[PDB]
Design a protein around this ligand. Structure first.
Ligand code: FAD
Ligand code: FAD
Ligand code: CL
Ligand code: CL
Ligand code: MG
Ligand code: MG
Lengths: 498, 500
C-alpha cells in the first residue's frame, strides 16, 4: 500500500511506458498496487471521478492499449509477481506481474513442470495468459488456456462499485462465463486479473504438485539453419516455403508423432543476407537426432542451396533462454506487428508476393520479417467452442513484423508492412478471413488496422477475425461484468449497439 | 518455507540443476536441495558435515570457474526459492535474498522505491554469489561499490563441533559478529558459509528513515552510445592512438570528485577477424550539457586516430536503459568461455599496446570472439578508504576483462592457451600477472581465474590471494579461522588459513 507515481517522480519516464517505445502514456497517477483490496479502492475512486483506467503487467502490448494518451490512471502489477502452488485450491497460482521467465524457472526448478506459454521471458502473465498465445510447447501440451483452472479478477458493477470475484472452470460456478472469457478474451476487456490458477483438467490425478501441470521434454535438440540470400532465386525460395508448408500440412494433427517439434521459419528481407530457421525437438526419445534430420532434409529438399546447420543439445530450462528460442531481449527499437492463422500453407500467389516484398528495392530496411511459427498438434485436440481461443485446427501462426529506429520514419515502415500484409491477403479483402486458407488472427498480437476500413475491405469485422463465433459469448460476459465499459481500448470487446 | 524433495540423478530437473550458467562445468552432485529457509540450510549442512560430503551453494549460477560444479561436490544447496527483494522495516534496510537475480533487484527497487544499487550489468546474475564479491557496474563511478551499501548479512555457518547455525552480522562496529560482516564486503562466494539474505542501505548519518532515501537514486534518463570502428584499414598506429587516447582520458577523469563520475563506458578491443572495434557509453542525460559532454568524450577517444567511427546515440529512461543489450549484454550463456581480469591504475604502456595489437590481429589463431574489454571504473569507488571493506582496490581507473568464447569442447585447449598467452604477455614485466600497487592493482574475485594460483602461469612470486585481496587477506584469514574452522566451504581460490 504505497504512494502513487506522478509527473515529476524519478520513476515516471519508465512507468508511463510499457516495453513498446512507440507509445508514451500521459497518466496522472501510476499505482503500484499490492492486493485485490488496493485495486478495488483505486478502480472505485477512478470510476467515481470519471477517470479512464488501464492495467500494465509485463508491458509487452504491441498497441497503444495502456499508453493511449486518454488513460488517466494506470494500475501497474509489478509488486504482484508471486508464483507458487496453492495447496488449498490444488493448483498453481501465478500473479499478474510475474514474468514468463520467472514462471518457467519457478515451476520447473521447484516442481519439474511448465506451461506451454510464450517464449519471450519478460512477457507478463497478466496480459498474456488471458489472450491465449503460442510457445514452443503448444504442439506438445496444447494452449496455455487449456490449463486455466480459475482466475481472480476485480470487476466494476453497474453502480460503479469495484469487487473481486474468483471465477472457475466448474460449469455450475455462477461466474463460470467470466472464467471462460479469460481463456482467450485478451487483456484490457473485463476487469483487473490479480492472479491465475493453473492445473491440468484431467480427472485421474493424485493431487501432488508435480503431477498437476505438464512436464517439458527433459533435454532438447536445438538447430539453427541459415540459407544465404545470395544463393536463393525465386524458384528456390518458393520450393523452400512450399516444402515447409506441406510438411506442416502433413504433420500438425493432435495425434501426430511430431507434436514434440517446434520451429520458426524466418522469411527475412534479402537485404539481411540470410534466411533462417530455428528448430526444437524433444531429445529424449528413441531416434531424436535422425527425426530432426528428417525434418531439416524435408525443408531443404530440392531447394539447391545447402543450408548452414548447427545442432546443440541443452537441458530444458537452459534451452528456454537460448536466444534462438527466447529472442534477443532488445525492446529499444520501434516495431509494427501483424498476425494471421494459417489453416493451409501459402499458395503460389502469396509466395510470389512475399518474394517480391522481401527482395524489393523500393523499401530499405534489412529488419522486415515474415515468421512462420509451427502450430496445431495438441492445441487442435480441443473443440473450437470449449475456450475463447476458437482457432483449433490451424497448422501455423504467421507473424509479420518490421522494426526501425527513427520516429520520423514511422509512416514508411508502417506503410510497407500494411501493403505487404494487405497483398498477401488480397483475395480476402486484405485480411486473413476465418474458415478458409486462413483462420483470422490472434489477440496477443493485436493490430488495430483489422478494425480500419482503409485496410480491411473484407466486410469481416475485427471481432470475427480474433474470436470467430466466440464473440457473442464474450459480448455477454462484457455486458454482465463490465456493464459500464470501464475496461476498453482500440480492440476491446464491445456489447451490441442497443 | 517448507522443505521439498531434493533432486538426484534420474530427476527431470537434474540436467539443468547439476549445471550453473557456465556450460564448461557439469556437476556430479548426489543431491541438489532447493532450500526454503535458513533452518533448512542448517539441516542440509549438518547432515553433509556428519557424513563427510563436500557442499557448494548455487545462487545465480554465473561462476566463471568450477567452484560449484567441481566433480568433488556431492551436495548442492540451490537458492532459487529464496528470491525475495523488499524493504525490511525490522532493520530499516532493503533485504535481498541470495536467489534474487540483479534484474529482479533493480526492477523491484526502482519501480517500487525509486532507488537502486551500483551492482553488475548482467540481469541474470544472482545476488548470492555477486554482492559478497564486490564487482563493478554502470553506476560504480557514480555511487561507489555495491559493498559500500552492505548493512548486514544473514549467513549459515558451521562451527568446529560441526553444528550449523545462522548468524546476522552487521556493519555496527560493536557487533560481536562485525568481522564476519566485513568479510562479506568483498571476500567473495564459497568461502565463509551460506548467505541467506543481504541487507542494504546507505551509511549516511543525516538520512530520514524512508526507503526512497535509504539507497542511491540512478540518473532518471541516460544517453547511450554505440561507437564502431572498422578493423579494415585500421593499422597499428591507429589502434595504438585509440587505446592511448582512451587511457589518458581515464587517467585524468576517474577521481572521486570528477564531474565524469556520471559516465560509464566499455571499450571492446576485439579480434581483427571480427571486423570492428566497438565502444558502448552511458552518460546521465538529466544535466544541462549532456549531449555535448558525451560528444567531448567520444571526440577525445577518436582524436587523431584517422578511422571515422560509426556512432549512434539514443536516450532512455533509466530502468529501460538497464536492459538495453549494449549495457546488459546479450543473454547468451550457451557457448564456452575462459575469462581473466585485472585492475589498471594506469592505462596500457606502449609495449602492452603492441602485444595487444599482435595478439588481436594474429593469423596464428582463428576465433573472431576474442576481446580485451576496458571498463570505466574508480570515481566514487575511490572515495572509500582501502581498508574499510574487503575490496582493497580503491584507486584504480579501469577494470580489464580478457575473454575468449567458442563452441566445441574439443577445442578448449586451443582457446584456453590463446587467452593464457595473451594475458601473460600483457603482464610479462611482472611475472605474467597484474601485480598490485604498480601499473596494475591485482584482480577482482567476481572474475576468478585459477591460473593466478598456477606456478606455470604466475611466475611473479605474488600469490593468488594477494592478487585478489592485497592486505585484506590476513583479516579474511582470521574470519575464516573463526567462522569456518573445519574448512567446509572451499574451492580452487577459496580463503585458507595459514599452514600450521
Ligand atoms: C514484447 C514481446 C511479446 C511477445 C513475445 N513472445 C510471445 C510469444 O512467444 N507467444 C505469444 O503468444 N505472445 C508473445 N508476445 C506477445 C504477448 O503475449 C502480448 O504482448 C501480451 O499481451 C503481453 O502481456 P503483458 O506483458 O502483460 O503486457 P501488458 O502490456 O502489461 O498488457 C497487454 C494488454 O493486456 C492488459 N493487461 C495487462 N495486465 C492485465 C491484467 N492483470 N488484467 C487484465 N488485463 C491486463 C493491458 O491493459 C493491455 O491491454 C515476446 C516479446 C519480446
Ligand atoms: C555470467 C555473468 C557474470 C557477470 C556478468 N556481469 C557482471 C558485471 O557486470 N559486474 C560484475 O562485477 N560481475 C559480473 N559478472 C560476474 C558475476 O558477478 C560472478 O560470476 C558472480 O560470482 C555470480 O554470482 P552468482 O550468479 O550468484 O553465481 P554462482 O555460480 O551461484 O556463485 C558464484 C560463487 O559464489 C558462491 N555462492 C553463490 N551463492 C552463495 C551464497 N548464498 N553464499 C555464499 N556463497 C555463494 C558459489 O558457491 C560460487 O563459489 C554477466 C554475466 C552474463
Ligand atoms: Cl490479493
Ligand atoms: Cl523477453
Ligand atoms: Mg525486456
Ligand atoms: Mg541467462
Amino acid at each position: 500500500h504505497i504512494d502513487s507515481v506522478a509527473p515529476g517522480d524519478i520513476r515516471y519516464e519508465d512507468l508511463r511506458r510499457g516495453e513498446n517505445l512507440r507509445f508514451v502514456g500521459d497518466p496522472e497517477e501510476i499505482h503500484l498496487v499490492g492486493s485485490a483490496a488496493e485495486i478495488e479502492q483505486v478502480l472505485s475512486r477512478a470510476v467515481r471521478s470519471g477517470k479512464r483506467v488501464a492495467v500494465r503487467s509485463g508491458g509487452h502490448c504491441y498497441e497503444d492499449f495502456v499508453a493511449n494518451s486518454d488513460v488517466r490512471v494506470v494500475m501497474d502489477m509489478s509488486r504482484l509477481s508471486a508464483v507458487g502452488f496453492d495447496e488449498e485450491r490444488g493448483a498453481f497460482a501465478v500473479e499478474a506481474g510475474a514474468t514468463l521467465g520467472a514462471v518457467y524457472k519457478t515451476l520447473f526448478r521447484v516442481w519439474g513442470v511448465t506451461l506451454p506459454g510464450g517464449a519471450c521471458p519478460d512477457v507478463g502473465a497478466g496480459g498474456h495468459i488471458l489472450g491465449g498465445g503460442y510457445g514452443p510447447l503448444s504442439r506438445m501440451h496444447g494452449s496455455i488456456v487449456d490449463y486455466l483452472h480459475a482466475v481472480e479478477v476485480v470487476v466494476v458493477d453497474a453502480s460503479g462499485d469495484a469487487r473481486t470475484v474468483i471465477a472457475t472452470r466448474e460449469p455450475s460456478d455462477p461466474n463460470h462465463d467470466l472464467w471462460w472469457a479469460h481463456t482467450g478474451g485478451g487483456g484490457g476487456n473485463f476487469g483487473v486479473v490479480v492472479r491465475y490458477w493453473l492445473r491440468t483438467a484431467e480427472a485421474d490425478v493424485p493431487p501432488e504438485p508435480g503431477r498437476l501441470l505438464p512436464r517439458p521434454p527433459a533435454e532438447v535438440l536445438l538447430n539453427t539453419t541459415v540459407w544465404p540470400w545470395e544463393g536463393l532465386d525465386e524458384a528456390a525460395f518458393a520450393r523452400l516455403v512450399r516444402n515447409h508448408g506441406r510438411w506442416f500440412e502433413q504433420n500438425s494433427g493432435p495425434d501426430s508423432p511430431w507434436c514434440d517439434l517446434y520451429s520458426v521459419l524466418a522469411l527475412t528481407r534479402s537485404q539481411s543476407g540470410a534466411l533462417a530457421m530455428t528448430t526444437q525437438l524433444d531429445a529424449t526419445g528413441p531416434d531424436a537426432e535422425k527425426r530432426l534430420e528428417t525434418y531439416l532434409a524435408a525443408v531443404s529438399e530440392g531447394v539447391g542451396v545447402q543450408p548452414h546447420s548447427d545442432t546443440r543439445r541443452l537441458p530444458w530450462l537452459h534451452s528456454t533462454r537460448w536466444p534462438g528460442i527466447a529472442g534477443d531481449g532488445d525492446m529499444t527499437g520501434r516495431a509494427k506487428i501483424k498476425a494471421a492463422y494459417a489453416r493451409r500453407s501459402f499458395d503460389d500467389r502469396q509466395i510470389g508476393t512475399l518474394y517480391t516484398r522481401l527482395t524489393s528495392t523500393d523499401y530499405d530496411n534489412p529488419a522486415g520479417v515474415v515468421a512462420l511459427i509451427a502450430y496445431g498438434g495438441k492445441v487442435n485436440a480441443v473443440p473450437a467452442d470449449r475456450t475463447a481461443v476458437a482457432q483449433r485446427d490451424s497448422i501455423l501462426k504467421i507473424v509479420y513484423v518490421t522494426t526501425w529506429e527513427d520516429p520520423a520514419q514511422d509512416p514508411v515502415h508502417v506503410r510497407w508492412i500494411r501493403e505487404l500484409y494487405r497483398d498477401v491477403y488480397a483475395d480476402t479483402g486484405g485480411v486473413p478471413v476465418p474458415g478458409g486458407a486462413a483462420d483470422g488472427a490472434y489477440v496477443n498480437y493485436p493490430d488495430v488496422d483489422l478494425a480500419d476500413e482503409e485496410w480491411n475491405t473484407s466486410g469481416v469485422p475485427w471481432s470475427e477475425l480474433y474470436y470467430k463465433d466466440a464473440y457473442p459469448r464474450l459480448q455477454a460476459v462484457k455486458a454482465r461484468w463490465d456493464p459500464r465499459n470501464v475496461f476498453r481500448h482500440a480492440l476491446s470487446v464491445r456489447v451490441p449497439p442497443a
